Design a protein around this ligand. Structure first.
Ligand SMILES: [Cl-]
Ligand SMILES: [Cl-]
Length: 302
């Protein structure tokens, strides 16, 4: 069969490519038969829309950002904690290890098989002015993802958060509904947010992963062999994604700078002030002993 999968990005974006790559792998490991069609550009709805559809089995899979599960899977809050990961190497070692698996395992109770994470860089503020310190955030109308944690993060930074679907952000910035948002560089480039919010300040406040989920209702009708093939194709798509993503982070920086954007480097930003303001949120979002244990396991990963 053709499995249907959702994504907010366009057809050439690394996430879409990775899942399409996964699709090609599946079609060999099943011999021509099975495949994945990726519906890009939010065609199937917002990330939250598409998560709900996966849960009820209206669609087979979605590639979405970790924050899109924050009201559903408590463990998904964790990798979105502000300043949790020290760097890319830490993210990788922690998330592709036993602690990341515990997070993935948590989705099953909520009607989803979480197949894999993909890295998503670090998210940073961008606006019509630069931002070095929480004082600079005051008065900015900052779009965030529809997540209570992300709302609180931007408030803790000093901005006024406003939840909006990914697809609507470019227009929101144009019309002045919002004058700021936050994301990684490749997203900053792809959506052309850089043309309306040309000041990118590397606050690097979160490193939320992408998660690839499969409908448990559909999953449970498959054989163990088919299930294993699907897990295998997913795992194999990660190194492929990594090659594209590593390159895209670098090229996106070049592209946006050539197009007028000004990146304020991480060292220029008062990380300590942001960390102090945001750190209380960990305790706020540790809902269970199980969550505490995972956070501590991640912190302990060196
Ligand atoms: Cl969205
Ligand atoms: Cl987003």
């Amino acid at each position: 069969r053709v499995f249907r999968s959702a994504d907010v990005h366009g057809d050439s974006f690394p996430t879409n490519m990775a899942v399409k790559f996964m699709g090609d792998e599946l079609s060999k490991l099943t011999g021509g038969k099975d495949s994945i069609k990726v519906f890009g550009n939010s065609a199937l709805g917002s990330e939250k829309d598409t998560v709900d559809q996966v849960r009820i089995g209206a669609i087979d899979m979605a590639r979405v950002n970790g924050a899109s599960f924050n009201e559903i899977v408590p463990e998904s809050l964790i990798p979105s904690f502000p300043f949790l990961f020290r760097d890319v190497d830490h993210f990788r070692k922690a998330m592709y290890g036993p602690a990341g698996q515990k997070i993935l395992d948590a989705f099953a109770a909520k009607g989803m098989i979480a197949l894999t994470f993909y890295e998503s860089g670090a998210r940073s503020i961008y606006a019509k002015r630069p931002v070095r310190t929480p004082a600079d955030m005051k008065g900015l109308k900052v779009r965030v993802q529809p997540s209570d944690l992300m709302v609180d993060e931007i408030r803790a930074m000093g901005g006024t958060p406003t939840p909006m679907p990914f697809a609507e952000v470019y227009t929101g910035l144009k019309t002045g509904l919002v004058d700021a948002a936050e994301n990684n560089l490749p997203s900053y480039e792809e959506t052309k947010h850089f043309e309306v919010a040309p000041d990118y300040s590397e606050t690097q406040h979160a490193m939320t992963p992408e998660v690839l989920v499969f409908s448990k209702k559909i999953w449970d009708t498959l054989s163990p062999q088919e299930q294993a093939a699907i897990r295998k194709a997913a795992a194999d798509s990660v190194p492929y994604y990594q090659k594209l993503w590593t390159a895209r982070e670098a090229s996106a920086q070049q592209a946006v700078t050539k197009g007028g954007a000004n990146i304020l480097p991480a060292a220029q930003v008062d990380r300590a002030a942001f960390v102090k303001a945001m750190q209380p949120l960990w305790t706020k979002y540790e809902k269970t002993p199980q969550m505490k244990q995972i956070v501590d396991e991640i912190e302990a990963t060196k």
